[PDB]
């Protein structure tokens, strides 16, 4: 796994039928990935961990993208992790604030990279759950839970430093 921005994929697959087990059970998963090719791979990875089931011995029945059902709402996703340190493997519960699940998982991966130097391949997302105003443990997220929210954009540093690469005017950062 690497990244871009991820998409939620629904992948369902079954260990393919034999004489003995004629109608084997289906298994579904929530697989976050850049595209369906790698989603299907990721599915087989998790499915091999849990069940005696490999890509050879099974078939992916349905792989399909899942869209956010409330894009224009702003939600609080609680996301449960399982990374690998340089040392041993670990659990987390992070919280992010986003318009989408996929975005919230992308937003997680980036943080893990930054905060722990945890590379994609090390990480496992277990559950991602949209959560209320309450049931939010993280004060980073809590500070935005407020009706009359108000703040300035204080030391508003300029970009466009090479539209006029040279100039008469020294810039301004108050607005």
């Amino acid at each position: 796994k690497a990244s871009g921005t991820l998409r939620e994929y629904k992948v369902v697959g079954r260990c393919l039928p034999t004489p003995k087990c004629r109608t084997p059970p289906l298994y579904r998963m929530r697989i976050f990935a850049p595209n369906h090719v790698v989603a299907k791979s990721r599915f087989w990875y998790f499915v091999s961990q849990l069940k005696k089931m490999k890509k050879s011995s099974g078939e992916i029945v349905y792989c399909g993208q899942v869209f956010e059902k409330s894009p224009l709402r702003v939600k609080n996703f609680g996301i449960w992790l399982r990374y690998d340190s340089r040392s041993g493997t670990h659990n987390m519960y992070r919280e992010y604030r986003d318009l989408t699940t996929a975005g919230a998982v992308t937003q997680c991966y980036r943080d893990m990279g930054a905060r722990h130097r945890a590379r994609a391949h090390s990480i496992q997302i277990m559950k991602v759950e949209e959560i209320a105003a309450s049931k939010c443990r993280r004060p980073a997220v809590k500070q935005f839970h407020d009706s009359k929210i108000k703040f300035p954009l204080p030391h508003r540093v300029l970009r466009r430093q090479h539209k006029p690469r040279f100039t008469t005017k020294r810039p301004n950062t108050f607005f």
């Binding site: 980073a140 500070q143 935005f144 703040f151 300035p152 204080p154 030391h155």
Partner: protein
């Protein structure tokens, strides 16, 4: 993480008049003026209320070390208010097992000659920071009085005459001598 907002308030007393050129609080009242420039602290020094009753210090999107300044600016302002109203009086008592540290102020407060510390021929002259005025007290035998508006300058000038009288190459648990700060008070209490 970044804290969306933090702030504090400092209720100035109706005796004092504080004014702020941007981020440079100037506090004036009974005893005199005290300016102090916080250009280097990066905060919103609002000054709200009719009768100009309180000073408010915001600090937007601060990380933990940025949010520590919020209070400290407020505290320095408090001390600035105090200095204008009451003033600061640091009392410091001389100590010795033998050599009775002969102190004597000179120009006004300014200079402090500290003769016969530990039997030393070397007379320690010690200047004061401008505004601070040392004076040898009565009602207490071996004891100095440092008065001034700006606390910083007073307490440093105390430290000058504390460190001046220091013992080299001996057991300082034994040789307890010098002029030490005994009481940090005000000129007038109300």
């Amino acid at each position: 993480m970044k804290t969306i907002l933090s702030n504090q308030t400092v209720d100035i007393p109706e005796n004092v008049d504080i004014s702020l050129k941007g981020r440079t609080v100037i506090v004036k009242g009974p005893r005199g003026t005290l300016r102090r420039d916080f250009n280097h602290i990066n905060v919103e020094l609002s000054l709200l209320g009719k009768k100009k009753k309180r000073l408010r210090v915001d600090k937007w999107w601060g990380n933990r070390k940025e949010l520590a300044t919020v209070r400290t600016i407020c505290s320095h302002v408090q001390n600035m208010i105090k200095g204008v109203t009451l003033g600061f009086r640091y009392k410091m008592r001389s100590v010795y097992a033998h050599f009775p540290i002969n102190v004597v102020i000179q120009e006004n407060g300014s200079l402090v000659e500290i003769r016969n510390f530990l039997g030393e021929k070397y007379i320690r002259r010690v200047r004061m920071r401008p505004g601070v005025a040392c004076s040898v007290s009565q009602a207490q035998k071996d004891e100095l009085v440092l008065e001034g508006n700006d606390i910083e300058l007073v307490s440093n000038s105390a430290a000058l005459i504390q460190q001046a009288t220091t013992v080299k190459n001996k057991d300082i648990r034994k040789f307890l001598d010098g002029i030490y700060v005994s009481e940090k008070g005000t000129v007038q209490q109300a």
